[PDB]
Amino acid sequence: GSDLGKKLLEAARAGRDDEVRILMANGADVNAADVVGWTPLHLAAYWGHLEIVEVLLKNGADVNAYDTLGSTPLHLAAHFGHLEIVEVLLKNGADVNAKDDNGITPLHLAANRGHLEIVEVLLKYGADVNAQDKFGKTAFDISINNGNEDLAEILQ
Amino acid sequence: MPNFFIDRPIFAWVIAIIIMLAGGLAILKLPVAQYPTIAPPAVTISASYPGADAKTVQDTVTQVIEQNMNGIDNLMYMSSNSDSTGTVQITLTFESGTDADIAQVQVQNKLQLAMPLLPQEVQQQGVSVEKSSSSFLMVVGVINTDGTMTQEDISDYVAANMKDAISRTSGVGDVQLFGSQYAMRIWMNPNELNKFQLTPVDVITAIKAQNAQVAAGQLGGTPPVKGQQLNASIIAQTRLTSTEEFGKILLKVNQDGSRVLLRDVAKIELGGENYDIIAEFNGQPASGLGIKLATGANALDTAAAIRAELAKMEPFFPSGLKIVYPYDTTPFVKISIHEVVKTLVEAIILVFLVMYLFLQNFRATLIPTIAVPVVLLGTFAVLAAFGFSINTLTMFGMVLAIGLLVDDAIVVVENVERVMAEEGLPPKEATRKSMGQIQGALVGIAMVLSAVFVPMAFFGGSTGAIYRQFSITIVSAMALSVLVALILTPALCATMLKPIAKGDHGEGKKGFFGWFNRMFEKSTHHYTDSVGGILRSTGRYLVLYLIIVVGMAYLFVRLPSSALPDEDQGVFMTMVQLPAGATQERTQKVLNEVTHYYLTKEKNNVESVFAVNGFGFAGRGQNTGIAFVSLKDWADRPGEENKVEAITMRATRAFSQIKDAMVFAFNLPAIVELGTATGFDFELIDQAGLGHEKLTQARNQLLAEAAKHPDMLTSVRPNGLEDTPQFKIDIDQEKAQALGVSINDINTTLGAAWGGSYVNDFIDRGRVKKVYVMSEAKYRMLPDDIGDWYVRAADGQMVPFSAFSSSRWEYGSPRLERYNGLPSMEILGQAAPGKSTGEAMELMEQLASKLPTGVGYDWTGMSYQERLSGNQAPSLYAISLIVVFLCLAALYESWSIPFSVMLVVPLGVIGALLAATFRGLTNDVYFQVGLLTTIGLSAKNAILIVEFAKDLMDKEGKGLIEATLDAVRMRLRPILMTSLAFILGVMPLVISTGAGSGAQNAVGTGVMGGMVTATVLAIFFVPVFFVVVRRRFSRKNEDI
Amino acid sequence: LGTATGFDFELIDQAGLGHEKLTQARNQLLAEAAKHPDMLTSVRPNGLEDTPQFKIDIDQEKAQALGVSINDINTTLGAAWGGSYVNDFIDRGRVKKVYVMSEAKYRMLPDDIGDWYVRAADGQMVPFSAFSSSRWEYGSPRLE
Amino acid sequence: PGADAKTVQDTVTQVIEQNMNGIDNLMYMSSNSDSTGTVQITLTFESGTDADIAQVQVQNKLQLAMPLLPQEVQQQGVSVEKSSSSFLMVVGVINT
Amino acid sequence: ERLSGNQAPSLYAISLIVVFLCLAALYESWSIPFSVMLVVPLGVIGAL
Ligand SMILES: CCCCCCCCCCCCO[C@@H]1O[C@H](CO)[C@@H](O[C@H]2O[C@H](CO)[C@@H](O)[C@H](O)[C@H]2O)[C@H](O)[C@H]1O
Ligand SMILES: CCCCCCCCCC
């Protein structure tokens, strides 16, 4: 319950790159968490603030930090098409096969929204193509259900 | 007319008494209110969807209703809010002067044909259409001192045994409850439900079946058989009346033969329909009623009527139940009136003193003491004829006019006292000659004054509505004043005034009066000598006149303009805003800190705090709150330190070390039904189906550019709430079908359990109320509780939610805004110190055009009104100036001489501007009407001077210089008398610090400053104007 | 305008007392009004008096035990004894209503209740006498 | 149709009555609910009240209680009329 | 009836005052009007 921790969370969400840098120098906790378990790196990934993702990882932020439902920055980045952020997270040792409480992986979420570029990068970093969610669904199954043939070809 | 009534003094009296009677009768039966209808008429469509989120409300209710809001006349704009509490408000604002009855019915008629498209759940709650443009008369608070009743217990009694009886009280319009009547609560237990293989669906089904009112016909019903002996109603199932009866509802019979009753799977109690609002009054549980005033209803009667009707139920109340008044606008209206009446009485006894100083007899001093009151009374009868009310604007309209009404009395009585002393004619003959000189001018003055004030009424919007109150009031009183001056004051002059010896100016008297008469005679000689010298070198003073026009023009641009001044009304607001995801309990801790502070550190000033949890002006929900701070009477709050503006700043500063929660105290605006009035009101609109997330990006992009210009723009902020974490749950349709679980059973179980469901009605102590099913609190708090809930498959097995559902955190809006049927975000802000709102608006437009393609904008509220009332402002000044010229041209029978009068305008303006600029006030409506009444009175003085001068040149064939100097000598005394009486009349208004002093200061200061300069400058410049104007514009006439 | 002679008084229940207690209060006022024939004359109620009503209770347990839907019961009782507006038809080019109801002779007396059968889930026909009881009780034919 | 006084009162009359507010120039409201399944709610307005404005304000309030009424009552049609007017004549029709 | 009760006397008073003021203007006198207004009961006694 640190004041500077709450400011960083709000600052990293709105995309204040310079205010982050200042709060980092002032000694604000990089791994401060919401009520729902979101860190600044969660928010930066979700809203697509690349520089802040790079700045937070440079100041020793947990790249594999997980929320109360088991979702990581990579889950959010991969889901909502932030390709540049997916590359940076994976370059800083992000768990490519991270399972949320539903057994959903970055590859599932990327496949769900038909982000071909992100899917191909996740596969390059060794994403388990046969990984099943709690319902036994693979990325390929998701692609077939959505009628995405281009994406189905890649996972076959 | 004067000659006729000089011979018939009793006829004159009869007319005056009839006017007084008509006035006094109007005063009794006229509606009294703080303000009239200023705010443009507005109709609000209110609907609720219990359990629904902002987007569910928007996409099933708001958009559907909005798409059918067309073919409606006089619609300016439409705005809507859809929030996380399942509430929607669509506001349709109509043009000023739109029939509010016609507006409401045209909206209702369009809504009525969208009703079948709305969800049944929304229809059952009832979709109200109301006139929202009206303001709160008072708020009745209800508490239980015994501490026996909870918020829900109190709210029920107020809803079922008060709300209606209050609506029936004389002059009462709209009424809104702080809570709800009792609803029968079924608090379901998922453990017990699963244990007997049951779901919320079975509970709802069982309630509809076993809580039913059945029509069963009659014994011997029609058509009957012959010989039938008995006719009797058949009574089958009737609505349940108690928690006991609801508990006995048989859900199922087990195979072993045991019974599952509703009380075996649920807790059963009387509770609220809704729990999203917690109201407190000095920390203790409370309900209440927000009462509104009806069309042309007396506010002082309605207030007294309710207080009397509530005292009639005092014995009928249960033990402890006490009525409190945390918000009432009646006490401020009574003072606002009493203070205005005090000013009118003070002004009359001041005219009495000034009339006895100059004329020095009690017979002459009574004529203005009779004529002025007659006109004031008569005006009310005229106001009653136009359908106006006794309010702040019409009340101060008479205060601002008193100078014009007092002059009409003095001008008549003085001119008779002059003629008698100069010529030695008897009173009756002196009045005939005296009235003969002024009669024609007084009629001409009326036409000129009309042209000054009448065009002020033809302003559009809310500013025009304010202006029109002064326009009609001043013109009405002025018109009556001239009528009374041609009927009564001549008759009274002829009969009451005693004769004066020829050449007797009271310098033969002794003591103080003897000194004054000798002193003023010398002063009058010195004045004519000073003017005589000024007229021999006019050229120099025309350059001095230009310096005043330039000086005026400079002060006019430098002086900031305001709407209306802030007032201490014995109330103010404290808004509470906790961060995203903040709970009811956390918000209640902050309101308790705020409540405690006011009852502790402001114990001497504050009477009560009405804390409201779950409602704010930015939006509503668990992270928002408000506190109505009710102050003690002004009589117990002496000094500026104990005023609303001082307590406000003390509180806002005291709420700095607050435990991460935004808490600001602020005073109410003059007209609350208008809101703020300072700054601008911007709408950012999505006009290409971009989406809410992209509209936020564009909003953030605009706010960042607005922060780059602190020079021009200040406090540019969004009015709405920010996106909050939402718990998104996905149903797997395949796994649901695989397990044989109906998607309807799933969504009904989730919906009814977590959201709550309105099943049907029951009868609580003879009154129909709602039955709600919902999960008991402890089984619908956290995500892990989702797996406690089981649905029954076709095969009879119980499947948990965890089997066929996944969940994740996702951001979404707790308050979705729309403008003109498109997604919008409202942005507030103001021009920085020095800069004008017009300049600030121009910048916002240029910033808005840099935003992404598909993003547009529009102006709303006071920005829409200003942008509209701009092109008409200059034309109405031009229309006024042309008609004044044409009136003066007809009076004097000349195209040139009118200029000699119209040049006197800036002489009064320079003083007002200096006085207002010196005292650091603003260019508000009170200042602006103050200029017109100052310019009007200065113009009237110039008209009477030029009349006398022109009369002498025509009637007696005198020279230009002789006639000019004769005129200014005759017209000095009456000018200085009116000026002095009026300057003293408005002196209490300038030094006023009490209740309603904000308005009094705005009236008095500009008038006192303006009158001082107009008085001193005009007596020297008016003769200069006539001489210069007559010499330049004339053929071979004569200077001899 | 109506009558115009005399007065028009309204006695109001303002504490959820109930219809039976409002009558008691009304009777108490009319009795005191009769004690002053000097002042008041023909002080009478405008409305009707409470009449015998045939109150029928459905046993929810026995209904569920026999597999008889409470909806089938209330629809059978309602439509038969009360009558039910089903839908519209076209009589000589004009739209008019279709009503279902019991023929007079099967909805006159309490004993006729046992003539009416509802079908259970199992397909058997259950009479009203199986799952219902009845008694005489007073009630208002005109609630003001 | 088929409903008793109390069934009419507690499903129709009370529901309509609870929504009869925000109506201008209302002196008093009275209602009858009878054994023939009939309800009459009478709203009497002040002398000089515009009867057209009175009817429409009542209708508008009734219209937003209609979804709360039993389907059986809605199907029969809920009329809003100016009852203050008097009978000009009664036409009788017979078959000789 | 309960409503139209407080206004009954005032309307008689308003009528009486205005009649007096009308007669006062006609004859140009505050006294002579009384000579006319005293005739009211002469007609009333017969009707009753
Ligand atoms: C000679 C110069 C002319 C000056 C006159 C200017 C008149 C301007 C003010 C007129 C206001 C009087 O209007 C009248 O006010 C009183 C209270 O004061 C109100 O009366 C109200 O308050 C009183 C307080 O005693 C209560 O008893 C009463 O139940 C309530 O109705 C009337 O409803 C209103 O009709
Ligand atoms: C005619 C020459 C004298 C001019 C001066 C007159 C006095 C002016 C005082 C304001």
Residue numbers in the entry:
A (entry chain B): 11 to 166
B (entry chain A): 1 to 1040
C (entry chain A): 674 to 817
D (entry chain A): 50 to 145
E (entry chain A): 866 to 913
What text appears in the publication on this structure?
The E. coli AcrAB-TolC drug efflux pump contains the inner membrane H+/drug antiporter AcrB comprising three functionally interdependent protomers, cycling consecutively through the loose (L), tight (T) and open (O) state during cooperative catalysis. AcrB is the homotrimeric IM proton-motive force-driven H+/drug antiporter component which recognizes and actively transports multiple drugs (antibiotics, detergents, dyes, and solvents) via the tightly connected AcrA and TolC channels across the OM, leading to an observable resistance phenotype. Four different entry channels (CH1–CH4) have been described with putative entrances from the periplasm or the outer leaflet of the IM toward the two drug-binding pockets, the access pocket (AP) and deep binding pocket (DBP) inside the AcrB pump.
Structural analysis of trimeric AcrB-Phe563Ala reveals a rather unexpected TTT conformation and the c-loop with Leu674 appears to block the tunnel.
